[PDB]
Symmetry: none
Subunit: 142 residues, 4 copies
């Protein structure tokens, strides 16, 4: 019920929330407590997790059990939240890489189909001979 | 000392054509001018040019046997210097680029021959035109930032792989 | 209903700033009224979901990019209003207009790499010449 | 007397006696100078061995020592001797100084350095740094919205 986002945030959905993976779980508790009448505890594997641990590191280890618990001081039924797989966390990221990589090959492929390295070698090399003659004749050149 | 001057011109290749005034009638046999055009490669030595001209001018006469006339190359210094026939043509010209006129002396011919050393614009005409063309072809960017941003993203995904404890690689 | 973009980071909507909380969007609407919640479409394969007032404005609508509209419940009457979300071309435009201008401006202007390198060699080639001659050399 | 001059390229022009002009490379051995000189002089028949001596107290450099390394040691004496097997008196050839050998070389650098400044000054006076950064930047923001909207760009 927690989704990776195009940016580096995380969307959470349960009986809609935003968090940063570098925020501590205390922030999650703060947001959750604001939508309810209140201690929020996080178990995952099983073991509870300190509210001073980063959410990023938390759902990381939670991938072992594919999900994690949320229990509330008062209510009796616990809440379970599925954690993103690695691929789930890296979808938009690996996508951006795939596209940038392809963007590069196009850029490089153009450079090749234009003989751009010989063009630079030819140009730079002959600008050298031109500059060199100017020094030989005792003149200046653009 | 001859009223007609020689010119050597540049070519778009490494080669040079040498235009010379030959003061011999084409049917003369021994020793106002006739033209001679000569393509030479800048690494051919001066001694090679001598051999070239000697084929296009009549022999000299010493006693009852013909001789190939000595041909010698001179240039500026403010006086005049004799150049070694083992000198490459291109390097010879390169040195004479300031005096704008060098001398070619034919044995048995009192009046020498002077060649106009080409101007800078002329010596460099073809190259400078190719530069303009090549430069024009280039003018028809985001690469550095793009490849940099990519490798960084490659790194973060490798990182999440090890943290999430899985293998990666596309 | 409609929400639209501005060339500055600010955002304009109208009806019957990105970093502000939804609570603020609720808080200042009440200045134009006699509890305001927000909702949007949610896929998992449809659904409507209530968003925390602590959600940033800009961070919120970026999640609603795919469904080009979102709900908003006001008290009193169960007649929810829907707001237009500008499509990609509509939002990126004022940016894309600046990019094209800039990229064209960049087009209006490299021997640099060779110069620097060719210089370093010369600088190195003379530094050596000084030492071989046992001389100090300054520029 | 004789003179050995630096040329705009790495070569060396040598002038010595109706003086004779020569072009040699600093990386060639003195034997090459001997070969070139012997061709422009009469024999003795066999070729005359010519020996090069620079100052130290006046010693002969081997025919296998490079001309470059020969003249940089000759600068101490600021000239060097050439003797021909046969001719009684010797030739002395002024050798270039360090500022002489590096004139054209240092001259090229000044022009390049200045050219580099002009190229860089244009970059400054045109806010080049802010240009690409704003460009590279808001490009990524655009490429990001496409990822958000699930579209291409």
């Amino acid at each position: 019920r927690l989704l990776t986002t195009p940016t580096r945030l995380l969307k959470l959905i349960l009986p809609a929330l935003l968090v940063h993976p570098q925020q501590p779980l205390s922030y999650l508790e703060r947001l959750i407590q604001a939508e309810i009448p209140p201690e929020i505890i996080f178990r995952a594997e099983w073991v509870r997790w300190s509210g001073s641990t980063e959410i990023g590191d938390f759902i990381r280890d939670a991938a072992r059990g594919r999900e994690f618990s949320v229990t509330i001081e008062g209510h009796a039924e616990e809440l379970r939240v599925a954690v993103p797989s690695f691929k789930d966390r890296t979808y938009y990221m690996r996508m951006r890489l795939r596209r940038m990589s392809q963007e590069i090959d196009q850029m490089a492929t153009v450079k090749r189909e234009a003989k751009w390295d010989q063009l630079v070698h030819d140009a730079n090399g002959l600008r050298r001979e031109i500059k060199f003659a100017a020094t030989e004749y005792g003149v200046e050149w653009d």
